[PDB]
C-alpha cells in the first residue's frame, strides 16, 4: 500500500540510522519482508521523482546498510585400453607433444585424464596432472569438472597421489577459484589429520587468491 510518502520515509530511516547519540566518539539488521518493503519503497521514490538516477544512488547507502575429433579416436582407444605402464606412458607422451603443438585437443581427453589422475604409479600420474592443468589453463569452465577427481586425489588412500595432488594444489586453486574454499579446506584437513605439511602450498594459494581478490 502506498499510504506513506517515500521521501519522508527514507529520510526518516536515514536519519534514524545516523542519530549522533549512536555514533558519538566513534549498522542495523532488518528482516526479509522488511528489506523487500524497503526496496520497493525506494523504487516508488524513484518513480515519483521521475515525474534521474542521482536520487537512486543517494538512497543506495541505506539499502546497503540495511542488508578434429576423428583423428584422436585411436589415441582415445589407446589411452582407454592401456593396461601396462609402458602403453599408458607412451600414449600420454604422444598426447603431450601435440598438446604442446595444439593445446585445444585436450578437451577430448578430459574424463580419461580424470581417470588417469589417480593412477597408482608416478610418471603417468604426474603426466596426467600436467596435461590436465594444461587443458584447464585454456578454459576456466573445465575447472569445475576436475573438482571431484582432484578432491578424490587429495583424500585418496594412496599417499603418492595425495602428494602429487598437493604439489599441484596452488595451480588448480588459481585455475578454479569458485571451489577454492573447499579445496584448501580439504588440503588442510589432509595435512592436519595426516602427517603432511601443506602449509606452504596453502599459504601460496591463499596469497595469490587474495591478490586477485583485491582486484
Amino acid at each position: 500500500e502506498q499510504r506513506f510518502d517515500p521521501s519522508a520515509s527514507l529520510d526518516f530511516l536515514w536519519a534514524c540510522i545516523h542519530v549522533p547519540r549512536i555514533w558519538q566518539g566513534r549498522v542495523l539488521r532488518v528482516q526479509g519482508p522488511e528489506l523487500i518493503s524497503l526496496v520497493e519503497l525506494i523504487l516508488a521514490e524513484a518513480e515519483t521523482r521521475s515525474q534521474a538516477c542521482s536520487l537512486i544512488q543517494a538512497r543506495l547507502p541505506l539499502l546497503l546498510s540495511c542488508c578434429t575429433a576423428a583423428e584422436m579416436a585411436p589415441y582415445m582407444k589407446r589411452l582407454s585400453r592401456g593396461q601396462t605402464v609402458e602403453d599408458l606412458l607412451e600414449v600420454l607422451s604422444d598426447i603431450d607433444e601435440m598438446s604442446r603443438r595444439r593445446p585445444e585437443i585436450l578437451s577430448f581427453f578430459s574424463t580419461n585424464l580424470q581417470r588417469l589422475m589417480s593412477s597408482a604409479e608416478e610418471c603417468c600420474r604426474n603426466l596426467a596432472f600436467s596435461l590436465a592443468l594444461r587443458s584447464m589453463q585454456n578454459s576456466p569452465s573445465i575447472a569445475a569438472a576436475f573438482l571431484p577427481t582432484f578432491m578424490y586425489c587429495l583424500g585418496s588412500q594412496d599417499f603418492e597421489v595425495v602428494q602429487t595432488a598437493l604439489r599441484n594444489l596452488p595451480e588448480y586453486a588459481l585455475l578454479c577459484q569458485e571451489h577454492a574454499a573447499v579445496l584448501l579446506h580439504r588440503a588442510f584437513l589432509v595435512g592436519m589429520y595426516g602427517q603432511m605439511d601443506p602449509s606452504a602450498q596453502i599459504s601460496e594459494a591463499l596469497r595469490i587468491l587474495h591478490m586477485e581478490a583485491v582486484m
Binding site: A181, L206, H210, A213
Partner: peptide, 10 residues
C-alpha cells in the same frame, strides 16, 4: 582455517 580461507578468497 575455514574463516581464514573464506576471508582471503573474498
Amino acid at each position: 582455517v575455514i574463516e581464514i580461507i573464506n576471508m582471503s578468497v573474498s
